[PDB]
């Protein structure tokens, strides 16, 4: 297991090809060109769905070459395209921006728990169910 | 700053501060700050201590104040001779005798109460101690 060299995790949705404002100079800091992170990444982003924020490795080596991999998409951005509401909370214990069901978060467990570590599906599922709780979204049991 | 809305008379005699106190036990809350010394607490001191302990507990739980400054303390104006009647009222005090529980507090943890009462007591002239509510 090697340690971090220079990778960072921050980017907007795949819909905006070559996004200059969120990263800014983040992927322009190292020797890597600006076009590299669009040709290498967006060519794989159109395979199934577009418009969802997904991270990638921004590591750099001494040969100007680099490797990448995609982890599970972040729940914060996922539950805007899978919850109806687009805004966020601010006071989760005093008001609720929206309402979600139980099966609505159950259906995301099979497609998202692959990176998550748990003995059981329910064990990883409750972690996803608690994401909404942190987001102020209530669940009707 | 606490002070009586009305009074029967404007000025009051100097008096003495002998005897023991009456409010020995924690009546309303769960923790109290008891005086072990003797003296008089001014209104400014009471206000400063109340602000310190409220800020310390971040406005959680409830806080009682078992003392009220009702004794008017006068003093003569600057550079005047000893006669010419009594001076004008400048501040208000509450006579404190040993054993008097000054403040009470509940709704917060024990160690948080310890720290709040210490910060409050650090602004008072008399020496204090921490006491807890007792059954019977």
């Amino acid at each position: 297991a090697k340690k971090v060299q220079a990778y960072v995790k921050l980017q907007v949705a795949a819909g905006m090809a070559n996004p200059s404002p969120p990263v800014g100079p983040a992927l322009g800091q190292q020797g890597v060109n600006i076009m590299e992170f669009c040709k290498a990444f967006n060519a794989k982003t159109d395979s199934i769905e577009k418009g969802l924020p997904i991270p990638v490795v921004i590591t750099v080596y001494a040969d100007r070459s680099f490797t990448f991999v995609t982890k599970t998409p972040p729940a914060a951005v996922l539950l805007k395209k899978a919850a109806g509401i687009k805004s966020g909370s601010g006071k989760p214990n005093k008001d609720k921006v929206g309402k979600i069901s139980r099966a609505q978060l159950q259906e995301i467990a099979q497609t998202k728990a692959a990176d998550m570590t748990g003995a059981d599906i329910e064990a990883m599922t409750r972690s996803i169910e608690g994401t909404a709780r942190s987001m102020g979204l209530v669940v009707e049991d | 700053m606490l002070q009586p809305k009305r009074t029967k008379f404007r000025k009051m005699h100097k008096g003495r501060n002998r005897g023991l106190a009456q409010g020995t036990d924690v009546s309303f809350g769960s923790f109290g700050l008891k005086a072990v010394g003797r003296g008089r607490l001014t209104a400014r001191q009471i206000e400063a201590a109340r602000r310190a302990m409220t800020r310390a507990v971040k406005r959680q739980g409830k806080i009682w104040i078992r003392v009220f400054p009702d004794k008017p303390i006068t003093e003569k104006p600057l550079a005047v001779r000893m006669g010419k009647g009594k001076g004008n009222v400048e501040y208000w005090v509450a006579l404190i005798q040993p054993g008097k529980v000054l403040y009470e507090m509940d709704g917060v943890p024990e160690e948080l109460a310890r720290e709040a009462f210490k910060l409050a007591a650090a602004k008072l002239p008399i020496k204090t101690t921490f006491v807890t509510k007792t059954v019977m």
Binding site: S20, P21, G24, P25, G28, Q29, I34 | L78, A79
Partner: protein, 360 residues
């Protein structure tokens, strides 16, 4: 003007592209201080530039649609497409207006509106009354409260000078552009020969500045000095100091008092005089600043200093800062100022963005 605003938006688009490139370069982040402002610049510019780019596509779509209508017999499809395009163009323009709406906290502050007669005399006084009514009805429409602080009435009617305070939401933002001279072309009521007379009126809009606070003198700040008093009095005057000089070190003000025999009374009197002098200095500084700002905002009173012209025979209102002529003068007279005020706000915000882009 539409042509001018589109031209500015195009320049902003070019600027937005340059900011994205500069952000990409990483030299700016090395600088750090340069990158922080540049990043804010991009944030404000991106939404407006995106909207503008979309609008640009819509205008091109309209040109192609007209061409499509003329030749291939695809006129019916083109007419529907063109009609939809028109709806889209109007919606994008309203969105642009929202994007360029001012976000400054200072704009929300209430304001004092002073309307003073210039050239024209009683005529100008009557126009001042008309202007005051105009603004008052506009304020009433937008739920604002107008309090007449001071009024100086004209002989034949109207007000020679009327100062009023308007309290509401967004008063300063809405009314800042009205300041300057205003010219009225009309046949005066006072006239008996039916001649048209050009007259001018000067308007000043000033924001309600935060309420004055007298800070209590800080003991550490003061440097009390005790020295012997001068004059008669014998042994007592010689041995007792009885004189106090207090110098306020921040403001560099020195007050000396030797009146009473008591140092305490001398010191008290000196403290009072010092407090009054500081309060007077602050008050005077405020008046000088207020006077200078008013002097700059108000015109000379001559017809040449203008920001709006109202021609009554032809019913035309013309704005000189940004080109715009409206053949109305009735709706505008009866409140309904939004039509005139809005393009100025949009242009001003665009100019502010350009200035921000140019700051170094």
């Amino acid at each position: 003007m539409k042509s001018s605003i589109v031209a500015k938006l195009e320049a902003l688009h070019e600027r937005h592209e340059e900011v994205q490139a500069l952000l990409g370069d990483a030299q700016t982040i090395a600088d750090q201080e340069r990158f922080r402002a540049l990043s804010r610049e991009y944030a404000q510019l991106s939404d407006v530039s995106r909207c503008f780019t979309d609008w640009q596509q819509v205008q091109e779509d309209i040109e192609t649609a007209q061409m499509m209508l003329d030749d291939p017999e695809m006129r019916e499809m083109a007419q529907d497409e063109l009609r939809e395009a028109k709806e889209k163009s109007e919606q994008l323009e309203q969105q642009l207006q929202v994007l360029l709406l001012p976000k400054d906290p200072d704009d929300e502050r209430n304001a004092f509106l002073e309307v003073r007669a210039g050239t024209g005399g009683d005529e100008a006084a009557l126009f001042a009354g008309d202007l005051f009514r105009m603004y008052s009805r506009y304020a009433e429409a937008r739920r604002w409260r107008v309090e007449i602080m001071s009024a100086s009435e004209g002989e034949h009617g109207g007000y020679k000078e009327i100062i009023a305070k308007i309290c509401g939401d967004g008063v300063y933002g809405r009314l800042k552009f009205e300041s300057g001279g205003h010219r009225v072309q009309r046949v005066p009521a006072t006239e008996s020969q039916g001649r048209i007379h050009t007259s001018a009126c000067t308007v000043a809009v000033m924001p309600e500045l935060p309420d004055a606070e007298l800070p209590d003198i800080n003991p550490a700040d003061l440097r009390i000095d005790t020295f012997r008093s001068s004059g008669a009095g014998g042994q007592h005057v010689n041995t007792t100091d009885s004189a106090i000089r207090i110098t306020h070190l921040p403001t560099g003000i020195v007050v000396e008092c030797q009146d009473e025999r008591s140092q305490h009374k001398n010191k008290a009197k000196a403290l009072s005089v010092l407090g009054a002098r500081i309060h007077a200095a602050e008050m005077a500084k405020r008046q000088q600043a207020e006077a200078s700002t008013r002097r700059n905002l108000l015109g000379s009173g001559d017809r040449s200093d203008r920001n709006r012209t109202y021609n009554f025979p032809q019913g035309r209102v013309t704005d000189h800062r940004i080109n715009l002529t409206l053949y109305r003068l009735d709706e505008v007279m009866e409140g309904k100022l939004d039509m005139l005020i809005e393009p100025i706000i949009q242009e001003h915000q665009a100019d502010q963005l350009a200035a921000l882009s140019e700051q170094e």
